[PDB]
Amino acid sequence: ASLTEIEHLVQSVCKSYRETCQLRLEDLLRQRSNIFSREEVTGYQRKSMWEMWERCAHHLTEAIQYVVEFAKRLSGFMELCQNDQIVLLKAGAMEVVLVRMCRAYNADNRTVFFEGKYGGMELFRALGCSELISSIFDFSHSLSALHFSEDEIALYTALVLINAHRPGLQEKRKVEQLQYNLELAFHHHLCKTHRQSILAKLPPKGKLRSLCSQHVERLQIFQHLHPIVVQAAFPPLYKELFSGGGEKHKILHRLLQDS
Numbered sequence: 504a505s506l507t508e509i510e511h512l513v514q515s516v517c518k519s520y521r522e523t524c525q526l527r528l529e530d531l532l533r534q535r536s537n538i539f540s541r542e543e544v545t546g547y548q549r550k551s552m553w554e555m556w557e558r559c560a561h562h563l564t565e566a567i568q569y570v571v572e573f574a575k576r577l578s579g580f581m582e583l584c585q586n587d588q589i590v591l592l593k594a595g596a597m598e599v600v601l602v603r604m605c606r607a608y609n610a611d612n613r614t615v616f617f618e619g620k621y622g623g624m625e626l627f628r629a630l631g632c633s634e635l636i637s638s639i640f641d642f643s644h645s646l647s648a649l650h651f652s653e654d655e656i657a658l659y660t661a662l663v664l665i666n667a668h669r670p671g672l673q674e675k676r677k678v679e680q681l682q683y684n685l686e687l688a689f690h691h692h693l694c695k696t697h698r699q700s701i702l703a704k705l706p707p708k709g710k711l712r713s714l715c716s717q718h719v720e721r722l723q724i725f726q727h728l729h730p731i732v733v734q735a736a737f738p739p740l741y742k743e744l745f746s747g748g749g750e751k752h753k754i755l756h757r758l759l760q761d762s
């Protein structure tokens with residue numbers, strides 16, 4: 504790639520992100536005074552474990568749907584073979600969601616936007632996975648302290664998704680080329696905006712992996728306890744990405760083949 508080509512890549516990734524960001528930043532900021540009351544938090548804490556799981560799994564899947572669309576619109580992604588598209592989304596979609604989530608996290612009062620209002624960690628007690636929840640809140644706090652712009656989130660999530668180290672890729676060199684061009688774009692944009700200092704402050708790649716592993720591990724516990732709930736009331740796409748041996752569905756293929 505050349506230098507104008509890199510800045511065109513920057514513009515194209517930012518555009519692809521804006522079209523698929525699910526919620527515009529201002530819509531999340533405008534709701535920050537809308538906080539759950541103590542009575543509403545209590546109501547969430549008294550919901551059954553299985554109903555809170557279903558609701559949370561539903562919201563995760565919705566967010567993952569916008570990530571799939573981001574990929575489909577991401578320069579060079581659809582030129583990868585189908586196998587590698589699926590590999591990359593299977594391993595990276597939850598990671599992208601976790602990074603995007605920091606937009607919905609208010610570091611001032613330690614709350615996250617959830618079902619129309621902002622609430623803290625205690626909102627999720629009924630899940631029985633406090634360690635996973637606090638890890639996500641802590642990760643969202645760490646990213647909020649960097650004050651990502653929307654352009655930086657677009658470029659960083661492109662790189663989270665386009666990761667040539669995922670096991671199972673068939674055209675590893677093609678993914679490497681794509682990853683390298685997106686890295687140049689991200690680092691070029693940081694340099695031009697005098698934001699190279701955040702590079703040392705970004706989370707190690709093992710953190711994002713660790714959060715996704717905790718998620719799958721707590722899901723396995725839940726699915727053992729409530730197997731019919733997962734079968735009857737979890738989104739098919741969710742089960743395909745995270746469940747075992749829930750990889751019996753083929754939703755990703757249909758989502759990618761469409762359009």
Ligand SMILES: CCn1c2ccc(OC3CCC3)cc2c2cc(C(=O)NCc3ccc(S(=O)(=O)CC)cc3)ccc21
Nearest residue numbers: 524525526559560562566603604606607615616617639
């Ligand atoms: C850390 C606490 N938390 C969760 C914890 C667990 C969980 O589910 C899995 C555990 C087992 C299933 C699910 C959530 C969960 C979901 C939401 C959510 O969807 N809010 C609505 C919203 C819409 C758009 C945006 S965005 O535009 O920024 C692009 C992402 C962000 C937010 C918020 C907090 C959550």
